[PDB]
Design a protein around this ligand. Structure first.
Ligand SMILES: [Mg+2]
Ligand SMILES: [Mg+2]
Ligand SMILES: [Mg+2]
Ligand SMILES: [Mg+2]
Ligand SMILES: [Mg+2]
Ligand SMILES: [Mg+2]
Ligand SMILES: [Mg+2]
Ligand SMILES: [Mg+2]
Ligand SMILES: [Mg+2]
Ligand SMILES: [Mg+2]
Ligand SMILES: [Mg+2]
Ligand SMILES: [Mg+2]
Ligand SMILES: [Mg+2]
Ligand SMILES: [Mg+2]
Ligand SMILES: [Mg+2]
Ligand SMILES: [Mg+2]
Ligand SMILES: [Mg+2]
Ligand SMILES: [Mg+2]
Ligand SMILES: [Mg+2]
Ligand SMILES: [Mg+2]
Ligand SMILES: [Mg+2]
Ligand SMILES: [Mg+2]
Ligand SMILES: [Mg+2]
Ligand SMILES: [Mg+2]
Ligand SMILES: [Zn+2]
Lengths: 138, 208, 150, 234
RNA sequence: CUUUCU
RNA sequence: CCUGGUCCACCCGUGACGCUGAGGCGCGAAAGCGUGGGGAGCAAACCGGAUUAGAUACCCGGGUAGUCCACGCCCUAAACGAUGCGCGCUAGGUCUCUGGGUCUCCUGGGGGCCGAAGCUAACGCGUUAAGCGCGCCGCCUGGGGAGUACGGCCGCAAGGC
RNA sequence: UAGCGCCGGCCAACUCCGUGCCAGCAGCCGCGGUAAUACGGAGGGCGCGAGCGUUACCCGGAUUCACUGGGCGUAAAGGGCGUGUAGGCGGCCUGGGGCGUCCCAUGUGAAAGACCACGGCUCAACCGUGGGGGAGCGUGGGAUACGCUCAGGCUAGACG
């Protein structure tokens, strides 16, 4: 079975971006879509849209990259240099609003899932709440 | 107790010139005047590239040997500046500069740091009246630092306060040569002091 | 302008019927303490020659360090081979907390306050490269912002 | 300088073992071979050629690189048809990268052509008088186009990048813009200004280059007449 | 073929 | 004759019924053990020839257990891909085995080789991962002492764990 | 009154003499078999200083039991394979619950110690006063994204 959907997605994204795919599909789920929403907002992806692959619902995730580079290996700088699951089944990770980490001295973000929806860390901190520490991204 | 022993040898080992004597240390004799090399049988041999350690060790030895202080005290003073808010490098110097024996010296009451220590010890000093003979007493802002009335007649205190006529004083100080008084206005800042020291190193040395 | 710290010089040897045949290698760091650091590893028949070649190679391999008030914009952990270097930014008066190798680079880098840690293989040469590499990846909220514009 | 009906030549090339990365520039297969999409070949031509005027109308140099026998001649032609230098026979390792060195070679060439006219023309055993003949022979066999370059080029026009992989790599290490008429069998990503189309065939190579050489002059106040290289297209 | 040690 | 696994096409049925798996139970090369049978060739041990300084060996001639069958036991191994299982994801090229197709190519299952990205100490691995991830089991923590001692459990014994 | 340790490298501090794989040093690597900065003394030096050095033990260095933070093709490390119990883990949509989880208030979290401030003893050590922090748990109120649970639905896993 597909043991962990949220990881499965971050990974697909991680994998696609690593070989510079333009778009990339992932089996859709409300929760997954919600995360991408932040992904798009924080400007980590061009964005995404609901599509239908072989009859079943997916989510194209339009990737984004830095510009072409100089000298050897003109491969673009990543926009998503990092992205890691944190809470994982059989090892859930919950944090109090006071225990919310500051990803990459603020240059990166962490996506929490709270009873107030799935906000980022600044959003959560602002709203004074905590929750499952889904993943960091920078 | 404090070092006590040939002092200009430190002057020489530390390369830099240290004023651990006041007079003479200005006369063509601080030895750093034609002999800026370390003491001992090897003074003049080539110097091998010092190790990261060496450097830090030396820098500390320098600063410390200046205010003539036991590593014991020096260290604790450091560990204190460490805890206190504010750039440690500064805070630390500010604290060394707050020792009574230092101020007595920074106020021209004494020719050197050593001498000022003795003045403090032999009770020739005042701190807002009450005499204080603890050379490691922390002089703080507002404190007036007089001279023992009884001692005010002492030739030394006279000669010293005499030549003090004219000489300016640190911007964190101020002295009334008349009544032989002086006030500790504020903790001197790093910029205020011109010590031949790289305290960033001294910090790093206690990092190890 | 460019200061020059020499990390390590080693002797090493090759074999030939008839004897061992050494050649030295020297790791050199070069920086202006402004924000430009350069690492070079040069080898050659005699120590001097090696050191020189190294400086040469170093100057030809510079990195732009985002020094922000003596420190670095954020934590980095770079693994070069079995060597892993860790860089944490620190406030004023902290000083440079790092091993002889990472330090020597960080210093000519113009870095004044950082927390450091060498994990894994502690091979100067590989740790050195790790350090350099870590610096190469340092970014600013500016760049980060720039990259996530559009 | 242009045209869209360049279907007259270039377009599709290379059986089918391509280089997945050249996927974009491909239109489809036919009887087995891929088909380079020319409309794109166009979009690229513009962009590329533009970059060339810039470089050209600036007095900038461009090292033409063509080892591929299928263009070995066209490269001399066009390159000579402009004060431009070229590497025609073998691309020596480090021409770009170890320039100050390979230069010493172009020095020797000159320093020799001298003796073979000087008072010493006939001096020392004809043996040396022969070894020196050789000295030049080869010196001139590879440094006839690389002759010019007094300093590192400001760019490089490579025939087939794959075949010329080394030339490219070097330039890149030196951040020397890379231009190239490349197709199916190559890594487009290593090319700065690409001309996706038949890496092989003279009828193709001849066109693109010549037009590109014209464009150079048609941007240097020379406004020269038709190319003497169309002759090598039979 | 076998054909030890230093 | 009896019977297991497995793959493809159609997409027809059920509707998360799934994955991993401490124990348990079972299977488990060879040699070995027990009872009975068999025994051509081969062949530990053994009996001889030769070689050698010696030859308890290699070479030559014989030769018993055994190798074979049955029923029961033993349970180990370089039991190896020295690489636990499942799922998703990340260029291709080439050869091959088997199925389907509109069958000079596409497509599914499997076996190989070269390889993108990436990983790796290196060697190498690279959609048959040693890459990117998640789930569950097992296992490692300097060498020798030592797979030994002691204890326990299993075995007829050898011996195993 | 000034002593004690050290000066081959880790590690700050180098020379002469004596000895000759001896006598000895030694934490590890090692040093000593006639030019020893490594033994013994001396001169000189480095570091601490009424202390200095040793031994012992604990934490550190040791991401070397790795939660933070490690690994198992050839370095130590995949179980000989399967079937499978407990246990761990669980696709998409919706609804109820609100156990986990998050939030607020409140009680508790003694004093001492730790932290900050000011103060007392000539300073400090020591001590006094005041202030702030504090996981955990109790009670009440709230949230529901995720996990759990219950119910309903689905076909993309699985089975047929
Ligand atoms: Mg590693
Ligand atoms: Mg069958
Ligand atoms: Mg159906
Ligand atoms: Mg139904
Ligand atoms: Mg058997
Ligand atoms: Mg039997
Ligand atoms: Mg026989
Ligand atoms: Mg026989
Ligand atoms: Mg068996
Ligand atoms: Mg296959
Ligand atoms: Mg590669
Ligand atoms: Mg391979
Ligand atoms: Mg042991
Ligand atoms: Mg028994
Ligand atoms: Mg030393
Ligand atoms: Mg001797
Ligand atoms: Mg530990
Ligand atoms: Mg761990
Ligand atoms: Mg390990
Ligand atoms: Mg092993
Ligand atoms: Mg196995
Ligand atoms: Mg679920
Ligand atoms: Mg609740
Ligand atoms: Mg007080
Ligand atoms: Zn002096």
């Amino acid at each position: 079975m597909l043991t962990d959907p949220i990881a499965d997605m971050l990974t697909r994204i991680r994998n696609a971006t690593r070989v510079y795919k333009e778009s990339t599909d992932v089996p859709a789920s409300r929760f997954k879509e919600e995360i991408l929403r932040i992904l798009a907002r924080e400007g980590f992806i061009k964005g995404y849209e609901r599509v239908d692959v072989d009859g079943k619902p997916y989510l194209r995730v339009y990737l984004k990259y830095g510009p072409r580079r100089q000298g050897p290996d003109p491969r673009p700088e990543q926009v998503i240099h990092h992205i890691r699951r944190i809470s994982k089944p059989g090892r859930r990770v919950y944090v109090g609003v006071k225990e919310i980490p500051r990803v990459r001295r603020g240059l990166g973000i962490a996506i929490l899932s709270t009873s107030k929806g799935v906000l980022t860390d600044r959003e959560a901190r602002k709203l004074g709440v905590g929750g499952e520490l889904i993943c960091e991204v920078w | 107790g404090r070092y006590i022993g040939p002092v200009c040898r430190l002057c020489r080992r530390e390369g830099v010139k240290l004023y651990l004597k006041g007079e003479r240390c200005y006369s063509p004799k601080c030895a750093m005047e034609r002999r800026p090399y370390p003491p001992g049988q090897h003074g003049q041999k080539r110097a091998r590239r010092p190790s990261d350690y060496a450097v830090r060790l030396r820098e500390k030895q320098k600063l410390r040997r200046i205010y003539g202080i036991s590593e014991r005290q020096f260290r604790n003073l450091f560990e204190e500046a460490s805890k206190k808010k504010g750039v440690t490098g500064s805070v630390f110097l500010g604290l060394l500069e707050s020792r009574l024996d230092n101020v007595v010296y920074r106020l021209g009451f004494a020719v050197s740091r050593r001498q000022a220590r003795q003045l403090v010890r032999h009770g020739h000093i005042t701190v807002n009246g009450r005499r204080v003979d603890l050379p490691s007493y922390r002089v703080r802002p507002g404190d007036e630092i007089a001279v023992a009335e009884k001692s005010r007649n002492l030739e030394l205190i006279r000669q010293n306060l005499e030549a003090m006529k004219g000489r300016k004083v640190g911007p964190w100080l101020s002295l009334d040569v008349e009544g032989m008084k002086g006030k500790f206005l504020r903790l001197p800042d790093r910029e205020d002091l011109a010590l031949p020291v790289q305290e960033n190193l001294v910090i790093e040395f206690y990092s190890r | 302008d460019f200061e020059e710290k020499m990390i390590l010089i080693r002797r090493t040897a090759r074999m030939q019927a008839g004897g061992r045949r050494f050649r030295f290698g020297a790791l050199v760091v070069v920086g202006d303490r402004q924000g430009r650091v350069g690492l070079g590893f040069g080898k050659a028949p005699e120590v001097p020659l090696a050191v020189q070649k190294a400086g040469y190679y170093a100057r030809r391999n510079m990195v732009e360090v985002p020094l922000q008030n003596g420190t670095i914009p954020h934590e980095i952990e770079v693994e070069f081979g079995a060597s892993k270097i860790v860089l944490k930014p620190a406030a004023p008066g902290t000083g440079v907390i790092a091993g002889a190798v990472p330090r020597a680079i960080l210093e000519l880098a113009g870095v004044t306050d950082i927390l450091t840690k060498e994990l894994g293989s502690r091979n100067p040469i590989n740790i050195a490269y790790a350090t350099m590499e870590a610096l190469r990846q340092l970014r600013t909220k500016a760049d980060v912002e720039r990259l996530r514009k559009g | 300088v242009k045209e869209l009906l360049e279907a007259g030549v270039h377009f599709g090339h290379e059986r089918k073992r391509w280089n997945p990365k050249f996927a974009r520039y491909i239109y489809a297969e036919r009887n087995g071979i891929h088909i380079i999409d020319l409309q794109k070949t166009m979009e690229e031509l513009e962009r590329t050629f533009r970059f060339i005027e810039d470089l050209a109308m600036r007095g900038g140099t461009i090292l033409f690189v063509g080892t591929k026998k299928q263009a070995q001649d066209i490269v001399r032609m066009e390159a000579e048809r402009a004060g431009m230098p070229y590497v025609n026979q073998r691309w020596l390792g480090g021409m770009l990268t170890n320039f100050k060195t390979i230069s010493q070679r172009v020095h020797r060439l000159e320093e020799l052509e001298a003796l073979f006219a000087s008072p010493e023309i006939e001096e020392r055993p004809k043996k040396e008088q022969v070894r020196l003949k050789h000295e030049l022979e080869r010196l001139q066999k590879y440094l006839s186009g690389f002759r010019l370059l007094k300093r590192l080029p400001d760019a490089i026009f490579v025939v087939d990048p794959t075949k010329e992989a080394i030339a490219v790599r070097e330039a890149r290490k030196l951040f020397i813009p890379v231009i190239a008429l490349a197709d199916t069998d190559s890594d487009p990503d290593l090319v700065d200004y690409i001309i996706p189309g038949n890496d092989d065939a003279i009828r193709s190579i001849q066109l693109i280059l010549s037009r590109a050489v014209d464009l150079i002059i048609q941007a240097r106040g020379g406004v020269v007449e038709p190319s003497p290289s169309y002759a090598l297209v039979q």
